[PDB]
UniProtKB/Swiss-Prot annotation, chain A:
Chain positions with Phosphothreonine modification: 3
Organism in which the protein naturally occurs: Saccharomyces cerevisiae (strain ATCC 204508 / S288c) (Baker's yeast)
Purpose of the protein: DNA-dependent RNA polymerase catalyzes the transcription of DNA into RNA using the four ribonucleoside triphosphates as substrates. Specific core component of RNA polymerase III which synthesizes small RNAs, such as 5S rRNA and tRNAs.
Region forming the signal peptide: none
Any one GO MF annotation of this record: single-stranded DNA binding
Keyword field: Cytoplasm, DNA-directed RNA polymerase, Nucleus, Phosphoprotein, Transcription, Zinc
UniProt keyword Transferase present: no
GO biological process: termination of RNA polymerase III transcription; transcription by RNA polymerase III; transcription initiation at RNA polymerase III promoter; tRNA transcription by RNA polymerase III
Protein name, as recorded: DNA-directed RNA polymerase III subunit RPC3
UniProtKB/Swiss-Prot annotation, chain B:
Protein name: DNA-directed RNA polymerase III subunit RPC7
Species of origin: Saccharomyces cerevisiae (strain ATCC 204508 / S288c) (Baker's yeast)
GO process annotations (BP): termination of RNA polymerase III transcription; transcription by RNA polymerase III; transcription initiation at RNA polymerase III promoter; tRNA transcription by RNA polymerase III
Function of the molecule: DNA-dependent RNA polymerase catalyzes the transcription of DNA into RNA using the four ribonucleoside triphosphates as substrates. Specific peripheric component of RNA polymerase III which synthesizes small RNAs, such as 5S rRNA and tRNAs. C31 is involved in the formation of the initiation complex.
One CC-aspect GO term: nucleus
Curated annotation (Swiss-Prot), chain C:
Cellular component terms (Gene Ontology): cytoplasm; mitochondrion; nucleoplasm; nucleus; RNA polymerase III complex
GO biological process: one example: transcription by RNA polymerase III
Chief location of this protein within or outside the cell: nucleus
Residues of the full protein shown: 162 to 316 of 317
Subunit structure: Component of the RNA polymerase III (Pol III) complex consisting of 17 subunits. Interacts with BRF1/TDS4.
UniProt protein name: DNA-directed RNA polymerase III subunit RPC6
Gene: RPC34
Keywords noted in UniProt: DNA-directed RNA polymerase, Nucleus, Transcription
Family under the similarity heading: Belongs to the eukaryotic RPC34/RPC39 RNA polymerase subunit family.
Organism whose genome encodes this protein: Saccharomyces cerevisiae (strain ATCC 204508 / S288c)
Entry function: DNA-dependent RNA polymerase catalyzes the transcription of DNA into RNA using the four ribonucleoside triphosphates as substrates. Specific peripheric component of RNA polymerase III which synthesizes small RNAs, such as 5S rRNA and tRNAs. Involved in recruitment of Pol III to the preinitiation complex. Involved in the configuration of an initiation-competent form of RNA polymerase.
């Protein structure tokens, strides 16, 4: 027997009852920022909207200044969205949200700098790598970075001439967007402020009706919201100026904040390249790394163009949103490319000669061969609109890709027979206790063990079959169902919980060796640890340090499976 | 009396024990080895976050004697940290309820 | 069909049926079978888009009849049932006209969530080990 005191000591059942979403965010903010910030962010997770008064009332910290300083620090960290709701009959106040994507920087930081380093065209010289690494760390750490301060801090004229040259590149690429109300305001509040004004300016006695005025109000709101969201998502108005007898430069007085959507697209394309690396041999797979490298820079949305979060989609004629999304994907020619255009970016190290066999040199008739084979592949990577130029769809690619990932995660966690059964339930809708044997022909004991194991999750939903006026699943048979959406809910929370646990354990280890870690992070200790540290304590420190190195590796490895599930 | 409801394919000795294992264990493949890239990733995680701890954004604080000793007189300080108000910021990027903590 | 025998489902026998059906798939759809992957990833080849690289029901029916490995015949419905049973476990990709191809069979036999035999778990008394059932 394991003791209840032995339990809850190494078992960690107290944390098992936390909601995974709160756990991970709280632990990230705790281990990075501090304790009061962790308390504030956890309270924000619990109560979505509240004022500074309500924080003062709800946390042990009543000191109005203290919560204020932690809130301005957290707001800088982009962890808080705010607004001002106008009380008309007295003093109008404000409310603060929590910004989910403001902590993903604290979560993706290693992948963030990895993309910033690797994705660039020139990386052979060492100095540029260190320079851009330090600049991206400074920007993601401080927050809104000001070139007015940065050039002032830089000490050499020959060195100020290139840091300004790196900012324009990040702005144009999409890693540096001017920061404004769009990153610090909630979507529903934006829409509810853009959704009643149109209902205030309409005249009276209009020969239309409530349904017609409502439809045209929704149209007007959608138009203005789409316009004002397009305006800052990508533009040249930060660097569209050009000074006399000088170079093109971003404005010196404005601030620069690093985005994350572009990095998310990079990570998603990385997952696709890894999928190809497992499935398709590297002879024709090295093309796919650049085939998506040159199209991601203007790639479309991944989950929601932000009109599907602040308002309801629809009830009747509810196909309109995906209809317009796929319609835009078809209409926009920026994503469509020909065999000639793809030639000027392909490096020589990819030969593009032996990548085909017409029976049993940087040439368009061969790269278009890979274009066509990708289009005609079983997974619709690209769709053929015109003969010669195609496009990559996201209307029907994300569902099948995510289902493949979900299936293979379940198969990696479980056995091949479990994979066979889940695939039977997937590719056969409405399976039954006999259709399993009809479509599987595997030994019943093993298949039902895998069935019972897979029931615990949200993969397989089971229906009770009513036979008499009383509903009982004890006299009649009962067949199965998929209801895949719950299955996607489940893999989000488990993985989020496990990352939360990993952050919790590293914070525990820091708590257990705070003195040692503080000694380690000292100016004189850095670089001189062999003579100073006596062998026994040095062994303890090196073992705990390699433990945390390994756990960071574990976290990064898990950082390649949950963000893909995050999509819709 | 609730002890004869035993299905046929179920043995009689494996019941009654219950006592599910302390923690269900399935070794995931996300506990693999380390490489140069993974080591560097751990090192960059070490530098990051530690950088913000050594920065101003801490907001986590909650030998304190009554007299400054002659040794403390004319003595080197711990650190002149750059405070929350010290660094310039963007005024139009905060609600009006927070500007007062700035030394404008 | 023959899947009915002695009241049970012939555990050893069925795996013999379900492993040979794809064995001649890889040696008939890939340009040169498994020896293409025997030299390195940057040396094997893929077929042209406009060639008939695939297999079909007729080929599998012929191979099963001539094999005489189970000493039994198989109606086209039965061969469809077999190829459908083995489309689970990610052993084939069903495309139009009941044509069949493999994707990563050599790699699986020999993060990239689609293959995990290369990565071996810690198997050590260490801590911070992640589990999937641990949450529930």
């Amino acid at each position: 027997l394991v003791t209840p005191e032995d339990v809850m000591t190494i078992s960690s059942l107290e944390q098992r009852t936390l909601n995974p979403d709160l756990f991970l965010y709280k632990e990230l903010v705790k281990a990075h920022l501090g304790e009061r910030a962790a308390s504030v962010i956890g309270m924000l997770v619990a109560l979505g909207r509240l004022s500074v008064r309500e924080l003062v009332e709800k946390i042990d910290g009543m000191d109005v200044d203290s919560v204020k300083t932690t809130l301005v620090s957290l707001t800088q960290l982009r962890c808080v969205k705010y607004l001002q709701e106008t009380a008309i009959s007295g003093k109008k106040t404000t409310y603060y949200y929590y910004n989910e994507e403001g902590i993903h920087i604290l979560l993706y930081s290693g992948l963030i700098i990895d993309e910033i380093i690797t994705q660039m065209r020139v990386n052979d010289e060492e100095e540029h790598k260190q320079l851009v690494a330090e600049i991206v760390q400074n920007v993601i750490s401080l927050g809104s970075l000001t070139v007015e301060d940065y050039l002032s801090s830089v000490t050499s004229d020959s060195m100020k001439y290139t840091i300004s040259s790196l900012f324009v590149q990040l702005c144009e690429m999409g890693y540096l967007i001017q920061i404004s109300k769009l990153h610090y305001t909630p979507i529903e509040d934006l829409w509810q402020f853009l959704y009643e004004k149109h209902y205030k300016n309409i005249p009276r006695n209009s020969p239309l009706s409530d349904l017609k005025k409502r439809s045209q109000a929704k149209m007007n709101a959608k138009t203005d919201f789409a316009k004002i969201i397009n305006k800052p998502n990508e533009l040249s108005q930060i660097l569209t100026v050009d000074p006399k007898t000088s170079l093109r430069i971003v404005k010196p007085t404005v601030s620069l904040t690093i985005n994350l959507d572009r990095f998310m697209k990079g990570r998603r394309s990385k997952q696709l390249i890894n999928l190809a690396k497992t499935r398709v041999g590297s002879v024709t797979a090295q093309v796919y790394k650049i085939a998506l490298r040159l199209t991601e820079q203007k790639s479309p949305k991944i989950r929601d163009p932000l009109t599907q979060t602040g308002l309801l989609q629809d009830l009747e004629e509810a196909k309109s949103f995906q209809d317009e999304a796929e319609l835009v994907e078809e209409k926009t020619p920026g994503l469509t490319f020909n065999a000639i255009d793809l030639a000027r970016h392909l490096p020589a190290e990819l030969d593009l000669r032996g990548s085909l066999l017409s029976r049993k040199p940087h040439s368009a008739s061969l790269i278009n061969s890979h274009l066509k084979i990708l289009a005609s592949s079983n997974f619709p990577f690209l769709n053929e609109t015109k003969p010669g130029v195609y496009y990559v769809p996201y209307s029907k690619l994300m569902p099948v890709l995510k289902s493949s990932v979900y299936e293979y995660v379940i198969a990696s966690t479980l056995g091949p027979s479990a994979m066979r059964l889940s695939r039977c339930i997937r590719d056969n809708k409405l399976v039954s206790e006999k259709i399993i044997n009809s479509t599987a022909l595997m030994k019943e004991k093993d298949i039902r063990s895998t069935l019972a194991s897979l029931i615990r999750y949200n993969s397989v939903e089971i229906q009770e079959v009513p036979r008499t006026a009383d509903r009982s699943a004890s006299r009649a048979v009962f067949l199965f169902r998929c209801k895949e959406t719950h299955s996607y809910n489940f893999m989000r929370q488990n993985l989020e919980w496990n990352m939360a646990n990993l952050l919790f354990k590293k914070e525990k280890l820091k708590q257990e060796n705070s003195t040692l870690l503080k000694k380690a992070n000292r100016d004189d200790v850095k670089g001189r640890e062999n003579e100073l540290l006596l062998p026994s304590e040095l062994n303890q420190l090196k073992m705990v340090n390699e433990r945390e190195l390994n756990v960071f590796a574990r976290l990064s490895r898990l950082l390649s499976l949950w963000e893909v599930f995050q999509m819709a | 009396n609730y002890m004869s409801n035993l299905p046929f394919g179920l043995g009689y000795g494996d019941v009654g024990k219950n006592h599910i294992t302390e923690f269900p264990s399935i070794p995931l493949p996300i506990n693999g080895p380390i490489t140069n890239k993974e080591r560097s990733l751990a090192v960059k995680y070490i530098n990051f976050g530690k950088t913000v701890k050594d920065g101003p954004f801490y907001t986590g604080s909650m030998t304190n004697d009554g007299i400054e000793r002659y040794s403390d007189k004319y003595l080197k300080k711990r650190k002149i940290g750059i405070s929350i108000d010290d660094h310039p910021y963007n005024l139009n990027l905060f609600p009006n309820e927070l500007y007062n903590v700035m030394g404008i | 069909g023959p899947w009915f025998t002695d009241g049970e489902l012939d555990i050893e026998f069925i795996n013999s049926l379900l492993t040979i059906v794809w064995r001649f798939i890889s040696e008939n759809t890939f340009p040169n079978g498994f020896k293409n992957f025997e030299n390195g990833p940057k040396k094997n080849v893929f077929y042209a888009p406009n060639v008939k690289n695939y297999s079909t029901t007729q080929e599998i029916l012929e191979f099963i009849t001539a094999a005489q490995v189970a000493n039994v015949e198989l109606t086209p419905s039965n061969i469809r049932s077999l190829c459908e049973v083995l489309v689970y476990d990610d052993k084939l990709e069903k495309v139009t006209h009941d044509c069949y191809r493999v994707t990563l069979e050599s790699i699986l036999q020999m993060f990239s969530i689609f293959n995990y035999f290369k990565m071996f778990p810690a198997s050590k008394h260490d801590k911070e080990v992640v589990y999937f059932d641990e949450w529930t």
